[PDB]
Structures are given as structure tokens and as C-alpha cells.
């Protein structure tokens, strides 16, 4: 099957943090994570982005190999 584009750094962060985020409803948990992404340190941001970049490089290689 066609390789799948990996999740962005911003979406990895929102998803990974959602389950423990709190409080009151899924809407409210999402709202707070989106705030938390905004207030990450530069070095934490940098780490999320580097991990996503690595996954994107793998995806690029897979597209080029894909039959």
C-alpha cells in the first residue's frame, strides 16, 4: 500500500498529551493541550520537530522506493 504521511510535530504533541491533559471534556482537554504546545520551551519544541522531521525523511525514502 501507499506510504502514509506521518503526523506533524504539532499533532503528535496534541495527541500524545491529550489522554492525561484534563479537565472536564474532550473539547476542554484539546483546548488546553493547544495552549500547552504554545508555551513549550524552544528546546522541547525543537525535539518534537526533529522527531517529526525524521519520520518525514523515512516517508520520503519509502515513497521513492514504493512499488
17 binds a copy of itself (CB under 8 A): no
Grid cell, residue 1, equals: 500500500
Contacted entry of Na ion, a copy of itself, Cl ion, none for residue 55, CB cut-off 5 to 8 Å set by kind = Na ion
CA distance 59 to 64: 9
Query: 10 Å Cβ neighbour count for 37?
Result: 17
- Integer Cα distance of 55 and 31 in angstroms: 26
Question: Is residue 58 involved in binding a copy of itself (CB under 8 A)?
Answer: no
Binding string to Na ion for residues 3 to 42, with x set by CB under 5 A, is what? --------------------------------------xx
Amino acid at each position: 500500500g501507499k506510504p502514509k504521511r506521518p503526523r506533524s510535530a504539532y499533532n503528535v504533541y496534541v495527541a500524545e498529551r491529550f489522554q492525561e491533559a484534563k479537565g472536564d471534556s474532550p473539547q476542554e482537554k484539546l483546548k488546553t493541550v493547544k495552549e500547552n504546545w504554545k508555551n513549550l520551551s524552544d528546546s522541547e519544541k525543537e525535539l518534537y520537530i526533529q522527531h517529526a522531521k525524521e519520520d518525514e525523511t523515512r516517508y520520503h525514502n519509502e515513497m521513492k522506493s514504493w512499488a
